[PDB]
């Protein structure tokens with residue numbers, strides 16, 4: 001199974017993804033294999049998110065290529081894959097949907113975020129606190145433009161459903177309730 005995490009920059013994707021992993025770890029042991037992938041695990045710097053000429057520096061399109069390959073190598077009916085990345089484009093989320101389809105395994109989307117304001121605050125504290133890291137800040141130019149071009153998951157579309165969301169204020173049990181529906185979704 002594939003679980004597409006999605007959210008704004010510094011919206012809590014990695015934090016929620018860890019919780020999901022720990023949850024899925026207890027549930028598998030109470031079978032499946034558990035995989036975790038992120039920009040950091042693939043050494044994809046956040047600066048990729050900033051035409052007629054071929055360049056040597058990796059593009060955002062190459063980042064999606066890297067992510068796509070990492071998932072295909074492990075994703076399968078017996079392999080649960082957590083993709084912790086912005087995953088902010090409907091088309092990209094549609095590619096991942098078709099990827100899980102080709103792996104003959106269910107897919108879902110898990111949106112995270114405490115808000116544009118609480119997310120902006122985080123990136124400032126991480127900019128203040130000064131590269132394959134989970135706490136490396138974005139440049140304020142790259143951060144703002146990323147939020148502007150974020151595409152909200154649409155449960156009306158089959159590739160953004162089943163959709164699940166987790167606000168920051170959602171406590172350990174409301175988060176735990178979502179995780180159970182994720183589990184039931186990626187089963188029979």
Ligand SMILES: Nc1ncnc2c1ncn2[C@@H]1O[C@H](COP(=O)(O)OP(=O)(O)O)[C@@H](O)[C@H]1O
Pocket residue numbers: 007008009010011012013014015016114122134135167168169
């Ligand atoms: N429910 C949450 N509640 C409180 N703080 C959070 C929450 N989610 C994320 N954070 C905090 O905000 C910062 C960003 O979290 P992180 O998961 O690393 O964002 P990103 O999705 O960009 O990787 C972290 O310091 C983290 O502790």
Ligand SMILES: [Mg+2]
Pocket residue numbers: 013014015038084085
């Ligand atoms: Mg992350």
